Amino acid sequence: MKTVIQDTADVYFKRKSDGKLVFTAEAQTASFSQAISEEKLRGGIGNKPLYILKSEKEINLTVKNAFFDLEWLAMTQGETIQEETKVKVFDREHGLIVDDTNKVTLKGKPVSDVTFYNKKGLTYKIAVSTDGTYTIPTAFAAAKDKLTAVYQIEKVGRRLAIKASKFSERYEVEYRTIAYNPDTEEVYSDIYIQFPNVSPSGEFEMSLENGNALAPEIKFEALADTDTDEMAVVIEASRDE
Amino acid sequence: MKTVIQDTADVYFKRKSDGKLVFTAEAQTASFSQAISEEKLRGGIGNKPLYILKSEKEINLTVKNAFFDLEWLAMTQGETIQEETKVKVFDREHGLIVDDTNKVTLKGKPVSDVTFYNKKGLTYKIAVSTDGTYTIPTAFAAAKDKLTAVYQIEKVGRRLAIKASKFSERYEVEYRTIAYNPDTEEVYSDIYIQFPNVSPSGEFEMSLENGNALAPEIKFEALADTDTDEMAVVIEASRDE
Amino acid sequence: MKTVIQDTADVYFKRKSDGKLVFTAEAQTASFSQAISEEKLRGGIGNKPLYILKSEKEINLTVKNAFFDLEWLAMTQGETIQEETKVKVFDREHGLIVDDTNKVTLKGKPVSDVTFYNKKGLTYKIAVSTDGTYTIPTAFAAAKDKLTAVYQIEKVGRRLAIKASKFSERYEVEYRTIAYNPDTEEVYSDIYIQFPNVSPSGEFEMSLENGNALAPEIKFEALADTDTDEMAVVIEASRDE
Amino acid sequence: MKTVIQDTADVYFKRKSDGKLVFTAEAQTASFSQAISEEKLRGGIGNKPLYILKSEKEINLTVKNAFFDLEWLAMTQGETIQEETKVKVFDREHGLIVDDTNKVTLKGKPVSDVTFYNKKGLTYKIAVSTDGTYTIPTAFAAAKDKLTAVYQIEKVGRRLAIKASKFSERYEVEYRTIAYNPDTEEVYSDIYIQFPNVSPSGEFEMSLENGNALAPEIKFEALADTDTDEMAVVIEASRDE
Amino acid sequence: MKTVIQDTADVYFKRKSDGKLVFTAEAQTASFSQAISEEKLRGGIGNKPLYILKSEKEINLTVKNAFFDLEWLAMTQGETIQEETKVKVFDREHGLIVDDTNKVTLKGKPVSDVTFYNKKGLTYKIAVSTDGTYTIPTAFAAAKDKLTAVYQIEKVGRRLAIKASKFSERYEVEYRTIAYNPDTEEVYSDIYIQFPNVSPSGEFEMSLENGNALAPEIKFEALADTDTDEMAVVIEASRDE
Amino acid sequence: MKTVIQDTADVYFKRKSDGKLVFTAEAQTASFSQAISEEKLRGGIGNKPLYILKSEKEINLTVKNAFFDLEWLAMTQGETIQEETKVKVFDREHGLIVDDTNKVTLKGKPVSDVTFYNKKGLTYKIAVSTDGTYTIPTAFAAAKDKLTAVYQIEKVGRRLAIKASKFSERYEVEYRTIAYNPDTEEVYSDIYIQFPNVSPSGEFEMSLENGNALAPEIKFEALADTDTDEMAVVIEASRDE
C-alpha cells in the first residue's frame, strides 16, 4: 500500500566463497542507480524514428557509513586482515633536558638511529646505544637546554596491505528499511532490496581533515546471476503476516 | 571494534638513502585516494560483456600543514639547504631630511648604487659614495624636505636553490591518528598508514594573501616497493597490548 | 534624449496568413538578443590585425507570462483549437460503503470498466454495469468496509492536438514599453520594437511543481524579410507630438 | 606618484567618416583587457626553452550605461536614425458596453481590420467601418456586456532598421577618470585612455524584466593605427600644470 | 585600391539563342579556376633549357546554389521544359479492411494492375476492376485484416527528358560581389566577372540523403569568343561615380 | 580452450654459428604476417576458371623495443662490436675570456686545429698550440671578449662499423606470451612462436626528434628450413601440466 519511508538502511554483506557476513552497519546513505543506452534508427520521408536499440543494463551501489571499520577497506582489495603481526612504527619524545655533563638519556627502547632536534631546528643523527645514554656535540647544545627525539619502535596489532595486482572477489548485498502507513501512524511494511551478485570497484578516498567525523564510502557494481539472470530483487513483507 | 575517527594525523618522513627524518608535523589534512581503469570487451549475438580488462592501480597523497618550514620546499626539489651563506637583499630607509647644504647622509652600508625618490615621482641614481654622505642633486629637491633610499645589503642566512635539472628523489611516509570507542568515550586504537615508496611531485603554490595564513600543500605519488610489491600498508593496534 | 526604462512590455502577435491577433499580454520578460560571427584578418611583418570580418547575423526572441493561455501552445505547433468537442476523461470517487448484502452503488455514469481499490492495494476490474450497482466478491471485501472506484467519464470542452508531422507557421510581433525623462519624473516616449517575419521554435517545459505558479515561455527566431531586408525595427514616439 | 583611482569614466565616441561626437555619458563600467600569445621554442640537447616569441595583440573594451539612448544601439548596426517617419503600431481599447441594438462604437481611427474579444475568450474580426459603428452577432454577446478591441494606428516618430547586410563602421573612443593623492586626500591627476581605431561588435541583449532598470552594454574591439602603430594611449596630467 | 572581398556572388545566366535570363540565384559558391601546361626544349653541350612551349589555356566555372530550381537541371541537357503534360506515377494506399464477403473497395482511381501486400510479406496481383471492388483469395488474406495497396495513377505537371543524344547549348554568365574599403569599413566598389561564351559540362550528382538540404552543383567550361578572343572579363566600378 | 591474449612478448634471438644469445627483450610489439600470390588460368567456351597456380609463401617479422641495446643494431649489419678501442670525437668549451695580451688559454687537450668563434660570428683556425695558449689578432677580437672554441679529443669505447659489403648471417628467433581463461581470470597457457631460420633485412629508421623517447625497429625475413621445411612454428603449453 501507499507508505512513507523516513530512515536510512541497515546493510548486510557476504562473501560467496567462504561465507563471512562481512558487516552489520548503521549507515548514512544508500543508492542503487540504474542506466540504459538508447540510440534511434531513422529514415524515410521526414526523418522519422523507426526503431530504438536498447543495449545495456548497468547498476551501481554506494554506501556511506558513520563509523570506521577496517573490513570496509578489506572489501575493496580482497586481502585478508592478519592478526597479531609484528610491525615497526615511529615514536616521538619531547621535553628532554641536557645535564651538566653534556649528556642526555632516553626513556624508551629504540630500534633505529635516533634524531635530535633543538630549539632552533638543527639535526644530529646518532646510532642506537646499548646503555641508552647519549652524547651531544657542544655546538648542538649546552647545559640546561631542551631537545626532542624521534625514532622507531616495535609494536603488535592487526595488519593489511594494498598490493599492485590482487583484485576483488564477488559478493552479496542487502538493504533494509521501514515504511509507515500514512493514516494510523505506525510501521506497516519492511522494505528489502537484495542484490545477488556484486563486485567491489576500487575508488576510495580518506580525507582526514581536522575536526571532521570521518565517513568511509564504498562503491560496487552489480552483475547478473548466472542461474536466474536477476540483477536485483525487491521485497515488501508486511508485519501483519 | 567499531570506532569513531575525529582528528587529523601526525606526519613523518624519511629519505631512503641517507635517512633524514625530514619532518615531524602538526598538520590539517591527509588523503590517499585510489584509481583504476577498465575497458570491457564485447561480442556475440547480444552485444554482451565477456571479459573485463583492468590496467592500473594508482595512489596519490596530500598533506597540508599549519606552520611553514623550509624543509617542505627542500623535499620537492632535492637541493639541500646550505647554511651560513652570504646573500644580497634589498633594504629601505624612510624619513631622510635634507640639510641646509643639500646633503643627506645614509645610515646603512650600501653595496649597489643608491636610488632616491623625491616627493612626486623623480628618480636619481648616484654611485656608492665612499664616505657615506651624498650630495643632493640640483633641482631634484630643496632644503627641509623628505626622501627615501633603496639599495642592497649583505646578510647571512640559509639558502635554497631552484634549478631546472635536479628533480625529486624517493621517500617513505607515515601518518598516525587515533579512533575513539563510541560507547565509553575513551581512546581505543592507534591508526597508521605507511607508504613504503613515494616520489614527490612538483605542483605547489605559495600564495601570500593579506591577512590570511599560508598553509603549505605538498602532493606526492606512491609507487610499488621492489621487495614485496606493496603500495601502502594500514595498521591498527590496540592500547591494550 | 536620455531616458530611463523601468517596466516590461505588452506583447502582441499576428499570423501572416489570416491575421489572428493571437494575444494581448501582461508579461514578465521580453528579449531581442543579437549575434554576429567575427574573425580577424592578419598580415604583414609582425602578425598585425588589419581588418575584422563580420558575416552571419541572427536575432532570437523570448517572452514569458504569468497566466496560462492555450493559444500559447497553439502558436508553437500550427494547429487550430477545436471548440465544443466530446472527450474522455478519468474520474474518481471515494467513501463507498458496502451494504450488508455484499453490494455497493456507484453514483456516476461510467463508460469503461470500473476498477475497485481496497485498504491494502488489491484490485478488481469489473465490467460496466447496466443498472447502477455492482456485487463485490467476499474475499476482496466484507460488509461495513470502504472502497474507492476509478472509471472514465465523458465531458465536453476545448481540444488541441499536437501532431508529429506539422510544424509552426510565420508570425509578426511587437513590444511596447515606456521610458521616463530623468529630470521631471514624467513619461516621455513610447518605445516599440517590431519584428516583421519570425518562426516559432518548439521548446517548452511546463513543470507543475507544488505551490508554484506556472510561467509559460515562448522562443522565436527572426528571419530576413524578402522585400526590404529588415530583421528588426525600433521606433520612438514622443507624447508631445 | 602613487595614486588611488576609485570611480568610473566619461566615455566619448567619434565616427571617422563624418565626425559625429556620438556620445557623452554618465556610465557604470569601463574596461580594456589585453591578451597575447606565447609559444616557447624548444630545441637542442636536453629540452631547453631557447626563446619566447610573442605573436599577437588583442585589445577589447566594454561600456555600460544607466540610461537608454538610441544612438548607442544605432552605432552597432551602421544605420542612421530617420526622423519624423510615419509608422504602424498596435493600440487597445478596454471596457465597451454593448448597446440595445447589438452595436458598438469606437473612439479612434482604425487603419486595419478590427478584432474583438469576449469575456470568455472568443474572437470576431470585421472590416473597418466608415462611421465607426460595428454590429456584433447575437451569439458573441448580448446587451449590457463588456468587450475589448484591438487595431492599428498611424503614429509619427523616430525609426531605425537593423538590416541583415549592413554592418558597423569605425570610431574613436576616449575615457577619463580622476586619481587621488593618498596623503592629503585631494585630487592630483586626470587619467585618460585613448583608442585611435575601434570597430564596434554586434553582440547586445535587451532584457525588459519587470522592476529592473535597463543597463545597455556595448562591446568594442580595437585595431592597430596605420600611421604610427598605436592601439591605445594612456595620459596622466596633474592639475598643478 | 586594395579591397577586401567577403561574399559570394549573385549569378546571372542567359541563353544566347532565345535570350532568356534563366536564373537570379542566392548561391553559396562561385569559382573560375585556370590551367596551363609547358614542355621546355633542351639541347647542346650541357642539358640546359633553350625554349619553353605554351599551348593550352582553359577556364572552368562552378556554381552551387542553396535552393532547388528545375531550370538548373534543364540547363545541363538543353531540353525545354514542357508545361502541363500528363504523366504516370505510382501511388500507395495503407489499410484496407477486408469485408465478410472477402472483398475490398479501394478509395482511389487506379490505372494499371493492383498489387496487395499482406502482413506476412507475400504479394497478390489482380487486374483492374470497374466498380472498385476486388476479390481477395482466402490464402493471401483472411477475415478482418489490413492490407497495403499500390498501383499507378495519372497526374499533370512539368516534364523533362534526359536524352542520350541531345547535348548542351551555349550561355552567358555574369557575377557580382561587393568590395570594402580596408580603412573606413564601408563599401567602395562592385566587382563583376562577365563570361561571354560558356559551354556546360555534364556532371551532376543529386544525392538525397536523410535530413540534408541538397545544394545543386553544376559545372561549366568557358570557351573563346569568335569576335575578339575574350575568355573572361573582370570589371571593377567604384561607388563614387 | 578459448583464451584471451593481452600483452606483448619477450623476444629472444640466437646466432646459429657461435651461439650468442644476443638479446632478451622488454618489448612493445611483435608480428609474423604471411603472404602468397595467385595466377589462375582460364579458357574454353565461356571465360571460366580452370586451374589455380600457387608458387610462393613468405613470412615477415617485426619487433619494437623500449630501451636501446647496441647489439640490436649490430644484428642488422652483421658486424661484431669491437671493445676497448680508441676513436676521435669533437668537443666544445664555451666561455673563453681574452687576457691583457690578446692571448687565449684552453683547459682541454686538442688534437686537430682549434676553430675559435666570435659573438659576431667570425672564425679563426690555426695549427695546434704546442704550449697551451693561442694569440688572437685584434681584428678578430680585441679584449675582455668572450670566445668559444672547438676541437677534437680521443676517447675509449665500443665501436661499430657499417660496411658496404658485409651482409647478414642467419639467426634464430623465439617469442613468448601468456593467455588467460575467461571464466576464472587466472592464467592458463603460454604461447610460443618459434622461427627455425631467419635472415635480418636492412631497413631501419632512427629519428631522434626532440623529446620523443626512442623505440628502434628491426624487420626480419624467415626462410624455410632445409632439413624439414618449417618456415615457422606455433606452440601452446598449458600450466595444469
TrEMBL record, chains A, B, C, D, E, F:
Name of this chain's protein: Uncharacterized protein
Source organism (scientific name): Bacillus subtilis
